[PDB]
C-alpha cells in the first residue's frame, strides 16, 4: 500500500495438489495489532495490481490482454475485504492513481489501442 | 412419434407450452411421450419391489412378477405405477410407462415465518389405501424426511425437502404403503387454504383456442 498499510503478494502459483488454476493474495496488516494475515482468491491470474494511496478502497485487475477485467474492492480497517463490481468484455489494464482520493482512471492503453 | 390424441397433436407442436396447462384443466394424459417431452433430462426412477404372485391351476402354479416403480422431477412431480406381467423386464418397463402416466404436481408450502422457497407440505395431509393411513406433517427448515424408507423415496422424489410422518396399519405390504403415500401427496392441490380463497378467472381451454389449428 502506498501509505504502507497493506502488503499484497500476487502469485503465479497454481497448486500442485489441486488441478484448479487459482491464485491467492496474502494481505498483512502492519499498522493494526499483531499482524493479521488474510487470504482472498480468484478463479483467474492477474496481469496488474493497484494499491490505493490513502484510501479505504482497492483496485484489482486480473486477466489476459483480451480479458483484462478490474474489480474495485472496498477494504475496511477492521474486518475483511470483498468485491463490488466486475465487468465482462473489458480491456482496462492501466491504472493511473491520483493523489486526490475518491477517483480512479482506468486505461486499456498497452500496445493494441 | 405420431400422436393419436387431440392433446398429443397439441403437444407435438408448440401449442401447449408447459405441463401445468394440462394439469390445470384436468385433461386426461393417455400417452407417455408427453411426460418425456416436458420433463426430459430431470426424470429419474427407482424400482421399489419385484414381487412374485402365483395362480394355482391344474398345470401347477403360474407365476407372475409384479413390479412397483416410482418416478420424479424434484421440484414438483411424482408418479407411481404398478404393472404385473410374466417376465421381470416386461413388468419394469410397463411400470415405468404407467408411472409416467400418473404424475401429479405437488403443492409445497412453508413452515412459519415464510422467507424463501417452499420446503414442506403446506398442511397436515392424510391418505389411505388398503389399511395403511399415512399422515404427512409440515416440518421446520432442515430436518430431513423423518419417515419409513418406502415413503422417504416418494417424498424425496417429489421435491419435498422436509416432512414429519405418522403411519398406521399393516405397513409391510409395500403396495398399499406407497399408494397411501401417493394419495397423501396427490392431495395437496385439493386442499383449500385461506390463500386460495381468491375468486378464479376462467381462461380459454386448449381445445377451445387451438381448434382452427387442429381441424387441418
Amino acid at each position: 500500500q502506498k501509505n504502507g498499510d497493506y502488503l499484497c503478494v500476487k502469485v503465479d502459483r497454481t497448486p500442485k495438489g489441486t488441478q484448479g488454476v487459482v491464485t491467492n493474495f496474502e494481505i498483512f496488516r502492519m499498522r493494526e495489532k499483531q499482524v493479521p494475515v488474510d487470504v482472498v482468491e480468484m478463479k483467474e491470474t492477474i496481469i496488474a495490481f493497484a494499491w490505493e494511496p490513502n484510501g479505504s478502497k482497492f483496485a484489482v485487475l486480473h486477466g489476459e490482454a483480451p480479458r483484462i477485467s478490474v474489480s474495485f474492492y472496498h477494504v475496511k480497517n477492521n474486518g475483511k475485504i470483498e468485491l463490488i463490481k466486475m465487468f465482462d468484455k473489458q480491456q482496462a489494464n492501466t491504472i493511473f492513481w491520483s493523489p486526490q482520493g475518491q477517483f480512479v482512471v482506468l486505461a486499456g492503453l498497452r500496445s493494441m489501442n | 412419434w405420431m400422436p393419436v390424441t387431440k392433446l398429443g397433436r397439441l403437444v407435438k407442436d408448440m401449442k401447449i407450452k408447459s405441463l401445468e396447462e394440462i394439469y390445470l384443466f384436468s385433461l386426461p394424459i393417455k400417452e407417455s411421450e408427453i411426460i418425456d417431452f416436458f420433463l426430459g433430462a430431470s426424470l429419474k426412477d427407482e424400482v421399489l419391489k419385484i414381487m412374485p404372485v402365483q395362480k394355482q391351476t391344474r398345470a401347477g402354479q403360474r407365476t407372475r412378477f409384479k413390479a412397483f416403480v416410482a418416478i420424479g422431477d424434484y421440484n414438483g412431480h411424482v408418479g407411481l405405477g404398478v404393472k404385473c406381467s410374466k417376465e421381470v423386464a416386461t413388468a419394469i418397463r410397463g411400470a415405468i410407462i404407467l408411472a409416467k402416466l400418473s404424475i401429479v404436481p405437488v403443492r409445497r408450502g412453508y413452515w412459519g415465518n415464510k422467507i424463501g422457497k417452499p420446503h414442506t407440505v403446506p398442511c397436515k395431509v392424510t391418505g389411505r389405501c388398503g389399511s395403511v393411513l399415512v399422515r404427512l406433517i409440515p416440518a421446520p427448515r432442515g430436518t430431513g424426511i423423518v419417515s419409513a424408507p418406502v415413503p422417504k423415496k416418494l417424498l424425496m422424489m417429489a421435491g419435498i425437502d422436509d416432512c414429519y410422518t405418522s403411519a398406521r396399519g399393516c405397513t409391510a405390504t409395500l403396495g398399499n404403503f406407497a399408494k397411501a403415500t401417493f394419495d397423501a401427496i396427490s392431495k395437496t392441490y385439493s386442499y383449500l387454504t385461506p390463500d386460495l380463497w381468491k375468486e378464479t378467472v376462467f381462461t380459454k381451454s386448449p381445445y377451445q383456442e387451438f381448434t382452427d389449428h387442429l381441424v387441418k
Partner: protein, 129 residues
C-alpha cells in the same frame, strides 16, 4: 338426551357443509353459538346468518360458501392457560399459517391469536379451520 348444544350445532354445520349445501338450519340457539358464528363470520368463513325468533330457544339459518374444511368441538372444556396454548394449537390445527382455536376468556369469546395479543387464557371451546 341432548347435552352440550354447541357440539350438535357444529356437527350440523359440518355434515351439511361436506355435501356442498348452501344453507343449514341450526337448532337450538344459544348465546354461545351466536358469538361462535360471529367469530367464524368475521374471519370470512361463513358469511351472514339469521336468528329466527320463536319465543322458545330459537333457530339459526346460516349461509355457507364452502370455505370450511372442519368445524369441531372440544368436550369437556379444558382450562387452557397461556403456556398451554401452543401445545393445543400444535395438536388441532393443520398449520402454523392458518387455522384457529376458539376459547372462552374473561374478555369474551375469542380465537387463539387474539388471546395471545390480549394476554389472557381461558377455557377452550372448539376449533375451525
Amino acid at each position: 338426551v341432548r347435552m352440550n348444544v354447541l357440539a350438535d350445532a357444529l356437527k350440523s354445520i359440518n355434515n351439511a357443509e361436506k355435501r356442498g349445501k348452501r344453507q343449514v338450519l341450526i337448532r337450538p340457539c344459544s348465546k354461545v353459538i351466536v358469538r361462535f358464528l360471529t367469530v367464524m363470520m368475521k374471519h370470512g368463513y361463513i358469511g351472514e346468518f339469521e336468528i329466527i325468533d320463536d319465543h322458545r330457544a330459537g333457530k339459526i339459518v346460516v349461509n355457507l360458501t364452502g370455505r370450511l374444511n372442519k368445524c369441531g368441538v372440544i368436550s369437556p372444556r379444558f382450562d387452557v392457560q397461556l403456556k398451554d396454548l401452543e401445545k393445543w394449537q400444535n395438536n388441532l390445527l393443520p398449520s402454523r399459517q392458518f387455522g384457529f382455536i376458539v376459547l372462552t376468556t374473561s374478555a369474551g369469546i375469542m380465537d387463539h391469536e387474539e388471546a395471545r395479543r390480549k394476554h389472557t387464557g381461558g377455557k377452550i371451546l372448539g376449533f375451525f379451520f
